[PDB]
Amino acid sequence: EPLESQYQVGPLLGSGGFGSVYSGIRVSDNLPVAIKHVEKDRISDWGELPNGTRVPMEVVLLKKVSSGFSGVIRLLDWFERPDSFVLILERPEPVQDLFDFITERGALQEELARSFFWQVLEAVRHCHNCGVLHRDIKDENILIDLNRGELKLIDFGSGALLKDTVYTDFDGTRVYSPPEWIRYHRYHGRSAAVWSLGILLYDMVCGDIPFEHDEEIIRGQVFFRQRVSSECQHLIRWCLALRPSDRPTFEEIQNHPWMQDVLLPQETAEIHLH
Ligand SMILES: Cc1cc(-c2ccncc2NC(=O)c2nc(-c3ccccc3F)ccc2N)cc(N)n1
């Protein structure tokens, strides 16, 4: 029943605005886990559990996206402490986040970026199907299960329940945020997610994000610093349309000619990760 007996705490993996994440092991079966701590006073968004229990939004959202689908990090357990919440999450091993992967490899070959981008799209569609909006899709929030070539979305701490009305709050990453958020402090869920996906795909094929300042985001002029195919540039420019309604739907992205003939995750690990 207690936290200390159920899990063996390992080293600190990282910390930041999201809280503190440790490597861990579930004592019973030696299953690798990640133990995330978040202070109650530092919590950006609070959520309501069906039984009335007040919990961080991440607990609500991760419970909604809980199935056999490997594209989203699994919430294994959670605990309330007097001044904090502790979340026990899945930990693939060996693992590397996409930001570190891109830093080490530079710009990704298009075949690899296609496989990775396709899995991110499948994971985001699963969230939206479950009524969950991530709101912080970026290289740092994507983990690569290096042996299986499977990607997982992490950090639902800036997320929200998906709705069809305007969002006026935002606590994700500014450089992945759309021009309507920068200009008006307003955005709709799906079209803002598609913009962050265009930032992510550019990041994968160029090895860096396209915009650093508010003025560049608002202007939305995309410059390619690396050699990128015409079909890939077209998809990126489409996701990054200034008008939210001009951005593609997830169906239009996955039917795009650049997205055809994706590798399977295991083929991806064999060709590119081994
Ligand atoms: C260590 C860190 C934390 C976050 C993270 C942020 C917010 N909320 C949760 C986070 N992490 C997780 O949930 C989480 N992290 C890892 C992990 C991440 C990077 C390197 C090695 C790892 F084992 C594995 C399983 C997880 N379930 C993000 C990044 N890039 N790095």
Side-chain angles (χ1 to χ4, degrees), residues 13-14 18 21 34 36 58 73 89-92 95-97 140-141 143 154-155:
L13 292 166
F18 54 86
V21 179
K36 179 179 175 168
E58 190 169 31
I73 205 73
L89 302 151
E90 170 192 1
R91 177 171 60 90
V95 74
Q96 191 175 36
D97 68 60
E140 294 174 294
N141 289 338
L143 300 185
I154 58 160
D155 189 16

Coordinates of all heavy atoms in Angstrom, one line a residue, residues 13-14 18 21 34 36 58 73 89-92 95-97 140-141 143 154-155, ligand 1:
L13 N 16.0 11.9 -13.1 CA 16.1 11.9 -14.6 C 16.1 13.3 -15.1 O 16.8 13.7 -16.0 CB 14.9 11.1 -15.3 CG 14.9 9.6 -15.1 CD1 13.6 9.0 -15.5 CD2 16.1 8.9 -15.9
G14 N 15.3 14.2 -14.5 CA 15.3 15.6 -14.9 C 14.2 16.3 -14.1 O 13.4 15.7 -13.4
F18 N 7.5 21.3 -15.0 CA 6.7 20.1 -14.9 C 6.8 19.4 -13.5 O 6.0 18.5 -13.2 CB 7.0 19.1 -16.0 CG 8.5 18.7 -16.1 CD1 9.0 17.6 -15.3 CD2 9.3 19.3 -17.0 CE1 10.3 17.2 -15.4 CE2 10.7 18.9 -17.1 CZ 11.2 17.8 -16.3
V21 N 11.3 14.4 -12.0 CA 11.1 13.0 -12.4 C 12.3 12.1 -12.1 O 13.4 12.4 -12.5 CB 10.7 12.9 -14.0 CG1 10.5 11.5 -14.4 CG2 9.5 13.7 -14.3
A34 N 8.9 5.5 -14.0 CA 9.3 6.9 -13.8 C 8.4 7.4 -12.7 O 7.3 7.2 -12.7 CB 9.2 7.7 -15.1
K36 N 7.2 10.7 -10.9 CA 7.0 12.1 -11.1 C 6.4 12.8 -9.9 O 5.3 12.4 -9.5 CB 6.2 12.4 -12.4 CG 6.0 13.9 -12.7 CD 5.2 14.1 -14.0 CE 4.9 15.5 -14.3 NZ 4.4 15.8 -15.7
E58 N -3.1 16.2 -15.3 CA -2.4 15.1 -15.9 C -3.0 13.7 -15.5 O -3.1 12.8 -16.3 CB -0.9 15.1 -15.6 CG -0.1 14.1 -16.4 CD 1.4 14.2 -16.5 OE1 1.9 14.6 -15.5 OE2 2.0 13.7 -17.5
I73 N 2.2 7.6 -23.0 CA 2.8 7.1 -21.8 C 1.7 6.5 -20.8 O 0.6 7.2 -20.7 CB 3.7 8.2 -21.1 CG1 4.8 7.5 -20.2 CG2 2.9 9.3 -20.4 CD1 5.9 6.8 -21.0
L89 N 4.7 6.3 -13.7 CA 4.5 6.2 -15.1 C 5.4 5.1 -15.7 O 6.4 4.7 -15.1 CB 4.9 7.6 -15.8 CG 4.1 8.8 -15.3 CD1 4.9 10.1 -15.4 CD2 2.8 9.0 -16.1
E90 N 5.0 4.7 -16.9 CA 5.7 3.7 -17.6 C 7.1 4.3 -17.9 O 7.2 5.5 -18.1 CB 5.0 3.5 -19.0 CG 5.7 2.7 -20.1 CD 5.0 2.8 -21.4 OE1 3.9 3.5 -21.5 OE2 5.5 2.2 -22.4
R91 N 8.1 3.4 -18.0 CA 9.5 3.8 -18.4 C 10.0 2.8 -19.4 O 10.5 1.8 -18.9 CB 10.4 4.1 -17.2 CG 11.9 4.4 -17.6 CD 12.8 4.9 -16.5 NE 12.9 3.9 -15.4 CZ 13.9 2.9 -15.4 NH1 14.8 2.9 -16.4 NH2 14.0 2.1 -14.4
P92 N 10.1 3.1 -20.7 CA 10.7 2.2 -21.6 C 12.2 2.2 -21.4 O 12.7 3.2 -20.8 CB 10.4 2.8 -23.0 CG 9.3 3.8 -22.8 CD 9.6 4.3 -21.4
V95 N 15.7 4.2 -23.5 CA 14.9 5.3 -23.9 C 15.7 6.5 -24.2 O 16.8 6.7 -23.6 CB 13.7 5.5 -22.9 CG1 14.2 6.3 -21.7 CG2 12.5 6.3 -23.6
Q96 N 15.2 7.4 -25.1 CA 15.8 8.7 -25.3 C 14.7 9.6 -25.8 O 13.9 9.3 -26.7 CB 16.9 8.6 -26.4 CG 17.7 9.9 -26.5 CD 18.8 9.8 -27.5 OE1 18.7 9.1 -28.5 NE2 20.0 10.4 -27.2
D97 N 14.7 10.9 -25.3 CA 13.7 11.8 -25.8 C 14.1 12.3 -27.1 O 15.3 12.2 -27.5 CB 13.4 12.9 -24.8 CG 14.5 13.9 -24.5 OD1 14.9 14.6 -25.5 OD2 14.8 14.2 -23.4
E140 N 10.9 17.5 -26.8 CA 11.1 17.1 -25.4 C 10.1 16.3 -24.8 O 10.4 15.6 -23.8 CB 11.3 18.4 -24.5 CG 12.6 19.2 -24.9 CD 12.6 20.5 -24.1 OE1 11.8 21.4 -24.4 OE2 13.5 20.7 -23.3
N141 N 8.8 16.3 -25.3 CA 7.7 15.6 -24.7 C 7.4 14.3 -25.5 O 6.3 13.7 -25.4 CB 6.5 16.5 -24.6 CG 6.7 17.4 -23.5 OD1 7.5 17.2 -22.6 ND2 6.0 18.6 -23.5
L143 N 9.1 10.5 -26.3 CA 10.1 9.5 -26.0 C 10.2 8.5 -27.0 O 9.2 8.1 -27.6 CB 9.8 8.8 -24.7 CG 9.7 9.7 -23.4 CD1 9.5 8.8 -22.2 CD2 11.0 10.5 -23.2
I154 N 4.6 12.2 -23.7 CA 4.7 12.3 -22.3 C 4.3 13.8 -21.9 O 4.1 14.6 -22.8 CB 6.1 12.0 -21.7 CG1 7.2 12.9 -22.3 CG2 6.4 10.5 -21.9 CD1 8.6 13.0 -21.6
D155 N 4.1 14.0 -20.6 CA 3.8 15.3 -20.0 C 2.5 15.9 -20.4 O 2.4 16.8 -21.3 CB 4.9 16.4 -20.3 CG 4.7 17.7 -19.5 OD1 3.9 17.7 -18.6 OD2 5.4 18.7 -19.8
Ligands
LIG1 C1 13.9 13.5 -17.9 C2 12.8 14.1 -18.6 C3 11.5 14.2 -18.2 C4 10.5 14.8 -18.9 C5 9.1 14.9 -18.5 C6 8.5 16.1 -18.5 C7 7.2 16.2 -17.9 N1 6.5 15.2 -17.4 C8 7.1 14.0 -17.4 C9 8.4 13.8 -17.9 N2 8.9 12.5 -18.1 C10 8.3 11.3 -18.1 O1 7.1 11.1 -17.9 C11 9.2 10.1 -18.3 N3 10.4 10.4 -18.7 C12 11.3 9.4 -19.0 C13 12.6 9.9 -19.6 C14 12.7 11.1 -20.2 C15 13.9 11.5 -20.8 C16 15.1 10.7 -20.7 C17 15.0 9.5 -20.0 C18 13.8 9.1 -19.5 F1 13.7 7.9 -18.8 C19 10.9 8.1 -19.1 C20 9.6 7.8 -18.7 C21 8.7 8.8 -18.3 N4 7.4 8.4 -18.0 C22 10.8 15.3 -20.2 C23 12.2 15.2 -20.6 N5 12.5 15.5 -21.9 N6 13.1 14.6 -19.9

